[PDB]
């Protein structure tokens, strides 16, 4: 049981070369989803807003597959996120380094699937003027790879509805709508697409 | 002493490290809280800051030894990096927890580990009404971030948070503090999901 998981990890991690990331030849699809926990702080002097959310990331690597009958019927395991490649998904308009609120650990499944869900506090650019009214304020931040075009990393979402089932019920801010939408940009130059996921939150003082 | 060097060699160099629990060799982690101080309430962001000791106890067969083969050593202190530790996490923090104590654990010859990080936690809580006789109630859940109850079970020895060390000159006095094991299931899976719910009632 433990003996098998030790073999498994040793065969995937110590007796292999590290995955060098995706390429144009071997591209990778990353699935994104947001579970929005709280709008903590809105700063009207600087036009910054602070969110707390869970970012669900899912991808699949061939190099991480294993036959579960060779390893004691183990179907999945938990491992430090340092032991594996992780996509470089970034908020394009943060104003402070993102703060990580959760252990940096992933779940790997025998078909190569990786599920990695970091909890984060993000300050980003957003004008809260009018948040105290009935219409609210709308804010948006785009998430994407910092260095990979869509030829190497494709982003998708399973749903355009942000998960609000755990939004803090006594937040200073009530959520009016929260969507997460795949966006593709082309530039007049290059065949390669550029994908981001646009997180759009409309909120107001409760 | 020369015995302790030997024992740490045999336990830590002569083996691969524990890869964490499995559905087939699951593990029980015992949680206890000692609340020291409500330091800060922030009524404009609904954050409250706690300072507490979080006692964690669990037991590995990998860390057993017979004391009579190691100079009668029954326990030893080691850096928490030499060993596996559970990923216990507050589910509604708003800042990374600040560690206030050395990351050092105590291992006993039956393979029991006792790890006690002192922490300052900022978490989601509405403090409106703290300046009344009734005070305010706040609650934050703790649990594993990646493991279900099939791999990590959570336990408490008592539902009573230890208040015997609460800072007597705090701006807030404690009315009650409890810690309760909770199990939620879901439609999809047979696996339990365990957390420990820290409920604190306090006023000015």
């Amino acid at each position: 049981s433990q003996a098998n998981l030790m073999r498994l990890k040793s065969d995937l991690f110590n007796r292999s070369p590290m995955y060098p990331g995706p390429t144009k030849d071997d591209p990778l699809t990353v699935t994104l989803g947001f579970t929005l926990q709280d709008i903590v702080k809105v700063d009207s002097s600087t036009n910054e807003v602070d969110l707390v959310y869970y970012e669900q990331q899912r991808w699949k690597l061939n190099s991480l597959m294993w036959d579960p009958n060779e390893y004691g019927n183990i179907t999945d395991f938990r491992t430090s996120a340092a032991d594996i490649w992780t996509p470089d998904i970034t908020a394009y308009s943060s104003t402070r380094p993102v703060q990580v609120l959760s252990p940096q650990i992933a779940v790997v499944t025998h078909d190569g699937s990786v599920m990695f869900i970091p909890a984060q506090r993000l300050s980003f650019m957003c004008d809260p003027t009018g948040v105290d009214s009935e219409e609210g304020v709308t804010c948006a931040v785009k998430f994407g790879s910092w260095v990979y075009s869509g030829f190497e990393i494709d982003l998708k979402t399973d749903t355009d509805q942000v998960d609000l089932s755990s939004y803090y019920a006594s937040s200073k801010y009530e959520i009016l709508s929260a969507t997460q939408t795949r966006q593709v940009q082309h530039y007049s130059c290059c065949p390669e697409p550029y994908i981001d996921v646009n997180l759009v939150v409309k909120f107001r003082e409760r | 002493q020369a015995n302790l060097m030997r024992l740490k060699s045999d336990l830590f160099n002569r083996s691969p490290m524990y890869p964490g629990p499995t559905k087939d060799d699951p593990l029980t982690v015992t949680l206890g809280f000692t609340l020291q101080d409500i330091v800060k309430v922030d009524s404009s962001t609904n954050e409250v800051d706690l300072v507490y000791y979080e006692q964690q106890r669990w037991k590995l067969n990998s860390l057993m030894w017979d004391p009579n083969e190691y100079g009668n050593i029954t326990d030893f202190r080691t850096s928490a990096a030499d060993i596996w530790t559970p990923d216990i996490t507050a589910y509604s923090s708003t800042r990374p927890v600040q560690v206030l104590s050395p990351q050092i654990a105590v291992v006993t010859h039956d393979g029991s580990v006792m790890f006690i990080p002192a922490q300052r936690l900022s978490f989601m809580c509405d403090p409106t009404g703290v300046d009344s006789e009734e005070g305010v109630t706040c609650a934050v859940k703790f649990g594993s971030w990646v493991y279900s109850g099939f791999e990590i079970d959570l336990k408490t020895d008592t539902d009573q948070v230890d208040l015997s060390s609460y800072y007597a000159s705090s701006k807030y006095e404690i009315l009650s503090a409890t810690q309760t094991r909770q199990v939620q299931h879901y439609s999809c899976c047979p696996e339990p999901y365990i957390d420990v719910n820290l409920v604190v009632k306090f006023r000015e």
Binding site: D163 | V146, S187
Partner: peptide, 13 residues
């Protein structure tokens, strides 16, 4: 709400 839970979600989609 298993698909909200950071310990369950590897089993959803």
């Amino acid at each position: 709400g298993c698909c909200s839970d950071p310990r369950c979600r590897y089993r959803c989609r």
